[PDB]
Assembly symmetry: C4
Homo-oligomer: 388 residues x 4
């Protein structure tokens, strides 16, 4: 109809309720489920769907061997109905590639897939299910993007890309698209020293992205974008409650403009909702691996370097595998506020579970509630032994 | 379009004709059918569909082992086309959880799923396929609801919940929702001593619910709701024709305001159509187990404590497994009356058939006919031996 | 939109072109295809689909054992996209039962399924995907109907039913429905001595049905219905070119008002287009079994007792299995005439191929061409050996 | 809406970006994927889909044995969602046959399937999913057509057919259809000596077809059609950059009006975009077999007999199997020009990989970019060893 405008502010997050779960690995043990990773969720005005990067093979299929690898010519961004698994029969391919993002602007959807060899990748921007624009690698070192939904405001949908090293400075760019065409692009500015896999959400005409500093920081870099001025700023979450993984133990004071040191060249895509006292941080329970997942209310985390938790909710027990996590919201819901949501990628198989030769995952996702709801843990649920 | 209003009375039930049957267990022996239980049927203005709680695994899949269990994080309310089986590929997830209800108000559908650990469950009310309201457990003991469709009148859709003991008094509440929001809730009143899994239907602006007294009664408790005044009353079916299971043998006189004694802490979800002489009761044939199923016309059963059958129809032979049963009607059909319908859950596997490690079911459903039709029996149809 | 009216006459049939073929048995050897029999084809204003009676099990599934049997509680009328196979995932159940008919009246579709034990069957007439009317058995001996599409004119859709013996006189009735309701019914009149499984088509406000005299006739009985007057007549095809199976060898003169003798208590559903010189008869090649299939142009077959073929087309070689055949046409196609079409049921398995324990079939269907097209043979295509 | 008119010229092709890839053979190793060959891509105004000729069996099914054969009664033209594989469950049959073409005219789609024995084939032209016209073989020797999309202009959709020898002169005809009816047909004229499997595209009211001279030429014959005058001309691509396979090594000067000699009675369906300096040729890398695939920019290839490459892009490595290739474009995309696209059939199995008894393929497809994008190679991806 008309382009959506981020006119509402976030609803108050007093707890998280269960939104969607596909039990893909459980079900896929005996049905045609595609091997995936890098999932996310994204809504259209009339439907919300699960998204991920397929590996171009079923889990039980012999080609599942080797799916720990990230970039092959057999991957593709696919979307499928909320809480169903990604099956060969219900999965819709949005584009071909090994890194992606996607978002609906109110009128139609924009999907971006990057493919190529490490030194010659290219992104192709699809709009209304057609290819419209192409961007060639600018640093010749794995051009890559968000791995979760982008956000639009009045037709403008900003997307964060990174090209170059994952263990040193790189060339991050913020592209502002409208109807799949490039209106403008900036180089990253601000104090964030390295940016990868940004998780974004929007409210009151501002887009917030919580990304990952793969190079040095265990605290998360944050990019705030003005989609009207088409400008942005960058910093780190000030809070001592560190949210990357692996990471050191939490200090009593964090860092606002430098990566918090202790762990180099590693990390995981993650997210956060930064909204004054209505601030909630997601993070793995383990400081060593992608294990467990919890939400922590840390009032003023972004700007208060001594902020510590005031409430919390466990999402996945530390005795269960987690992985990537990101943000999304249904901008077309009823009501006066946007209900914060997020998903957690539950990785199964390699490298942690090497008795099988594949790597895949299932999805669990929650949204906020103004009630103070009881909590449950949500694991993948599959028994690896069955796959042997 | 406009909210549906219960303006018609029931059609005269002279017999029951076959409406839908999915043969899920037969077919699932060699195809991707999800393991389920707690099924029901429910109509939208343009389609009627089968509903149930999936166990997040196929019947032939190795994760089918253990599905006798009721509440896990892998369950979800799913709906699929009438008379098809619940397959991994045609099943639509309405919400995540282990207890549910769902009903269309004429404009759109409301679905409610409860999930959680026993002491910290919560219900989330979805409307127009989006989460709108959340209700936290109030007694911290398995918050649970109908397991069959709710009914709406002018936008108001009442739902009966129970939280607390299953073998002593509990806290039952009747919530009145409109567009997924709570308009009001009452505590249970009347003479019903325990309420669980209500089967409801509506006619001439009144909603009737035949539930289950798990605690003491072998006769069924009944809740009649006025969706305009948003008030209700409760009693038991007066009739000596007892309809719970297990149950004692039928007496010659029943009880109108107390549970009929003889069996404690057990029972099964069931239903009835209470309409003066046009009154029909469903019940298992066996007084000891979920075996067989029959419909009995017991004129004035609700209010006549000596009422006995005047006609009847066998639905499932006593030599076949049955289970839950509930009511639904197509409120959007042509004609001057609402045609009473019902479904019977045909449970296969555990605990009665323990040579297999799973528990599932198929569905058979009938609707009334003003003709006096010949009768047939409708069993699940699967040979367990094939699954060994 | 508006009710369809049979305003056109048949197109000239100079040959038959391939219309649809599903290769169901071939494909089903390694995919979730339902076991069926009694197929047919039928069009809606915007789509033409394949129809059949499922056996409630896949071909490879263990429950396929025993599907030679005709009437069980696991059967159902299903429809699926043209030329696709009937799979567990793409099949839509129209109604439950073991004998059926179905036709679109221009506004919506009417489907009829009969179910029951032999002495207590009942038909339920669905209209606009809802049950509207029910008819109880009147002779208590396998109430049964067409097994191919019915035809409508201005909302009136006549259907031929038979109840009673299959090897002696029976009670055949012609019901005239409008919006699933009964307007009127007649007993069979005319010279046809026994009627079963009528194949019908309509043109210029007249409905022609070529049926089967299971009792005594090897020539086919024909019922011509006036859907406005709601009256009909009956006779046999006069032609010496006999079209039932089994049957005696062709004589030089046939019979117009009595069954042509030689074979008792047996036969197969078949059809014909009776249109003066534009008359074409379908029949198995073998006079002993359901083997092969050919179309023969026999000018004035209905009324000329010495009529013999003037042209012909082989559809299935005598070295391949055939079975039932029936008529249908797309009444919503462009053009000035109705293009005659038909399907042939290609039966595989029992009783002819008993190395397997199942019985199923695939479908091949043709429509007429005003061209004189080259001919090909169209067998099922499956190798039974693969199923052993 | 209204008939589409080829009003735009081609966009400048500076490189090729990835458009679609289905990884059908990889995925089909463990899921219900149909065995195919002769694929292509074609767009409707609101969707672009993959197309191919099914073999009426899954790859893993036992009937896959023997699918190296071209013409059987079990083949059918099927279409399925872009980048999904052709599965038994998501494939839509357009028509029955072993040679086909299909194109949308802006209002609806025309599909043509030819079936028959070698000496008695016939084409049936479907429009708006209904059979409209039939054409009988005129030379009684494998009537055959494009195997890729046709193109329409103001309702007129020309199609090139060939009937007769594949190793000597044959009878090629250009039919001009409108709404599935024949407006006119011409015999082939011009200097092309043999025509088979034309790949066509349209721009600025002219339709260009790059075909195959199976008889003598290693350079490709080209047919340019005026869909308004309904006339055409024919010649060969003048360029020394030879594009058929097998073929001799490239000379320094090609032939404009005679086949370039060196290889007889063999070849492969291929294509090209002939647009002055914006001219790009596709071809296998190997001069001996269907191995590898590359795009070469050969300015003025059609008319310059000494034209050689000025830029190029590898699509498939010479160490991977290729096969057929053809053209298509989305005539309903936004923008001021038509973006050239093409697909490559990646053949797996027989005859090159004979350890398996089947022959199938997957599809990879690209479209042009005005950017100068990095290149990647796109192989089928399946390991034959897994199928043993
Ligand atoms: C039914 O449902 C309800 C609803 O969920 C249940 O009630 C909830 O219960 C939760 C668990 O108790 C509770 O969550 C906790 O909230 C704490 C904050 O509240 C308390 O402090 C505030 C502030 O003073 C008070 O106002 C309030 O009254 C409370 O006293 C959080 O602090 C908790 O998180 C911390 O603990 C967990 C382990 O429990 C850690 O996993 C987590 O990371 C936090 O602790 C680490 O991080 C801090 C900050 O740096 C460190 O100081 C601390 O030492 C930990 O650091 C180590 O561990 C981390 C992680 O591994 C590592 O990185 C680091 O290096 C160190 O190794 C927790 O979130 C809910 O808020 C509460 N909800 C509600 C509405 O009440 C109820 O129990 C259920 N009922 C039943 C019967 O079960
Ligand atoms: C073709 O189709 C038609 C259509 O269906 C067939 O005709 C139908 O046939 C049915 C079976 O006969 C018949 O159903 C019965 O109806 C009885 C009522 O009608 C009779 O009584 C009235 C009232 O006086 C008369 O007007 C009428 O003319 C009849 O005489 C019911 O009473 C029957 O139900 C009871 O019996 C069945 C077993 O048959 C039990 O399963 C059932 O629960 C009922 O009996 C128990 O309950 C009562 C009440 O408490 C007890 O008194 C009794 O002792 C039983 O109690 C024990 O069993 C229960 C259950 O296990 C247990 O809980 C308890 O503790 C005790 O252990 C039955 O419903 C249809 O009405 C009739 N329909 C029509 C239209 O005619 C026709 O036969 C078919 N044709 C062929 C050729 O097959
Ligand atoms: C390419 O394609 C074209 C297009 O299809 C091919 O040409 C077609 O070829 C067909 C086969 O030749 C041909 O079909 C036959 O047509 C005959 C009628 O035409 C002839 O007679 C007329 C009338 O005088 C002439 O005008 C005309 O010029 C011809 O001379 C039919 O009579 C044929 O049917 C009979 O034979 C077949 C076997 O071929 C039987 O299966 C069939 O049942 C018919 O015969 C039985 O029935 C009759 C009637 O009672 C009996 O008299 C006879 O003895 C048979 O009876 C026995 O068998 C039956 C069946 O088993 C049994 O019940 C009975 O008891 C007895 O045992 C046949 O239909 C097409 O018309 C022709 N089409 C066109 C447009 O030309 C062309 O060949 C192909 N090209 C190549 C290179 O292959
Ligand atoms: C990242 O991405 C970019 C973008 O793709 C990469 O850059 C691209 O690199 C490509 C490979 O180098 C390059 O493709 C080549 O382009 C050549 C034309 O450009 C050159 O010549 C022009 C004209 O003078 C100059 O202007 C220009 O500056 C260049 O110097 C083509 O000529 C190439 O094709 C020929 O070679 C390939 C093998 O490389 C053959 O497969 C192909 O068939 C061509 O050669 C055969 O055919 C010719 C013509 O008849 C014969 O003369 C020749 O001998 C060959 O003949 C034999 O082989 C054929 C085929 O088997 C057989 O039939 C015959 O009988 C003989 O046996 C090639 O297409 C891109 O244009 C370039 N793109 C861009 C934008 O720059 C970049 O490298 C990537 N980065 C990294 C780090 O990898
Ligand atoms: C989002 O904001 C823009 C205004 O910036 C709205 O756009 C106006 O929409 C109306 C109706 O389409 C037009 O007449 C105006 O010209 C539009 N645009 C501009 C850019 O001036 C848009 O409608 C808003 N979206 C919604 C859903 O309200
Ligand atoms: C059900 O009853 C309500 C009246 O209570 C009907 O609601 C009225 O509908 C018309 C048309 O939408 C409005 O103008 C009235 O204001 C509506 N509501 C009320 C609450 O006054 C409703 O249309 C009835 N539903 C149907 C299907 O007839
Ligand atoms: C089929 O015939 C009937 C006439 O018998 C047509 O019915 C008339 O349709 C118009 C428009 O709907 C009405 O105003 C008339 O009253 C209708 N009916 C009768 C029974 O008089 C019908 O439209 C015809 N169908 C088509 C497709 O032309
Ligand atoms: C393609 O060209 C034809 C003109 O040749 C356009 O056809 C005209 O369309 C308008 C609106 O439908 C009619 O009033 C004219 O009579 C049409 N046709 C002719 C043949 O004169 C057609 O609309 C064009 N297509 C598009 C998409 O613009
Ligand atoms: C390119 C380096 C980057 C950071 C190490 O790699 C990612 C890490 C991943 C991970 O840590 O799990 C998975 C992503 N699929 C991958 N991105 C790409 C494009 O391969
Ligand atoms: C009829 C001869 C023609 C050229 C040799 O054959 C084609 C070659 C093919 C090929 O070279 O792979 C495949 C096509 N499926 C086939 N066409 C038909 C109708 O069978
Ligand atoms: Ca399987
Ligand atoms: Ca880090
Ligand atoms: Ca009880
Ligand atoms: Ca007979
Ligand atoms: Ca050649």
């Amino acid at each position: 109809r008309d382009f959506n405008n981020l006119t509402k502010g976030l609803c108050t997050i007093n707890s998280w309720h269960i939104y969607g779960k596909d039990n893909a690995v459980r079900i896929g043990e005996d049905s045609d489920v595609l091997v995936t990773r890098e999932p996310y969720v994204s809504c259209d005005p009339d439907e919300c769907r699960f998204y991920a990067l397929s590996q171009g093979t079923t889990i039980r299929g012999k080609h599942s061997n080797g799916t720990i690898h990230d970039r092959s010519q057999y991957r593709a961004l696919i979307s499928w109905p909320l809480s169903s698994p990604p099956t060969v029969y219900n999965s819709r391919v949005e584009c071909i590639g090994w890194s992606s993002t996607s978002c609906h602007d109110g009128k139609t959807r924009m999907s971006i897939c990057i493919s190529g060899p490490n030194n010659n990748a290219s992104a192709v921007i699809w709009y209304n299910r057609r290819p419209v624009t192409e961007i060639n690698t600018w640093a010749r070192n794995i051009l890559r993007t968000q791995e979760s939904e982008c956000v639009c405001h009045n037709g403008v949908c900003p997307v964060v890309f990174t090209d170059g090293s994952a263990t040193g400075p790189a060339e991050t760019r913020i592209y502002y698209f409208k109807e799949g065409k490039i209106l403008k692009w900036e180089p990253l500015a601000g104090t964030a020293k390295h940016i990868e896999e940004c998780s974004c959400y929007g409210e009151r005409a501002e887009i917030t992205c919580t990304c990952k500093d793969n190079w040095q920081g265990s605290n998360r870099p944050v990019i705030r974008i003005d989609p009207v001025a088409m400008t942005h700023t960058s910093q780190y979450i000030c809070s001592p409650v560190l949210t990357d993984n692996p990471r050191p133990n939490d200090p009593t004071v964090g860092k606002c403009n430098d990566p918090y040191p202790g762990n180099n060249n590693n990390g995981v895509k993650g997210f956060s909702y930064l909204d004054g006292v209505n601030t909630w941080l997601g993070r793995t329970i383990s400081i060593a691996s992608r294990s467990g997942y919890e939400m922590l209310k840390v009032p003023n985390a972004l700007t208060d370097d001594k902020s510590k938790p005031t409430q919390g909710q466990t999402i996945v027990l530390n005795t269960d595998w987690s992985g990537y996590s990101g943000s999304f919201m249904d901008y077309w819901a009823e009501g006066e506020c946007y209900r914060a949501c997020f998903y957690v990628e539950l990785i199964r198989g390699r490298p942690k579970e090497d008795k099988v030769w594949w790597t895949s995952n299932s999805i669990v996702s929650m949204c906020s509630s103004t009630e103070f709801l009881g909590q449950w843990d949500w694991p993948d649920g599959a028994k690896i032994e069955y796959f042997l």
